[PDB]
Design a protein around this ligand. Sequence first.
Ligand SMILES: Cn1cnc(N)c2ncnc1-2
Length: 231
Amino acid sequence: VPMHPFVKALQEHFTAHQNPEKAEPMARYMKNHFLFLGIQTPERRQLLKDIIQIHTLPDQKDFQIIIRELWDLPEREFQAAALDIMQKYKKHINETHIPFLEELIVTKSWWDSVDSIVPTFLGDIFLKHPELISAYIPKWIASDNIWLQRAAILFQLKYKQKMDEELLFWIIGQLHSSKEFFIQKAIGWVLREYAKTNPDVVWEYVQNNELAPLSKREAIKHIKQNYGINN
DNA sequence: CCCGAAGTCCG
DNA sequence: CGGACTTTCGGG
Ligand SMILES: Cn1cnc(N)c2ncnc1-2
């Protein structure tokens, strides 16, 4: 079975505009885990737009197929485009897509893709269906996969006043001993972000519970101005 | 325009 | 460790 024509068209059009000179530092920035074509986001968005204008966006029956085929292509711009395309199908994504999103998290994994999946697509799903959190989060924390662990930390990132504080702190407590940078930093990030909504609770948490030094410092990057740094 | 959100380099 | 500085991206 041939590649979906929309994906083939995108591949052809991206490749025709590749920039090997830019590709080298772009790939180095992601620690050479991926090949790059060398197309940065403004042009990459326009090239996608070009193909939608010519071909139209595929029927929703093909949504998951298109995403997978792009995920399987070697150059990282195709996963970035896949995520742009998933946003175009946003109104069709629901709680039944959690396993599909899980599989995207644990394939071609790195912070650029995982952070584009978790606080937005998964965050929205669990905001609407909080009763499903306990069907996934314990497994993610227990897994060997640091990107599922990061997903458990960051899916609430944008919740603001809808944050489940008890859940957030329980998740952080489970992962606070991790020596993995991407886990320590995610803990720092979600605490720093939630402190914009409720600084008192984050300050109390970091003063009274164990965290990696990186996590604590990132958490209080801003609110240390509000409380002061004791001698 | 601005500000806030990985990478290298240094002490 | 933790700060200074880097380029890119999202968004006010
Ligand atoms: C991706 N990226 C680029 N530049 C910065 N200053 C950043 N801080 C966090 N993440 C960043």
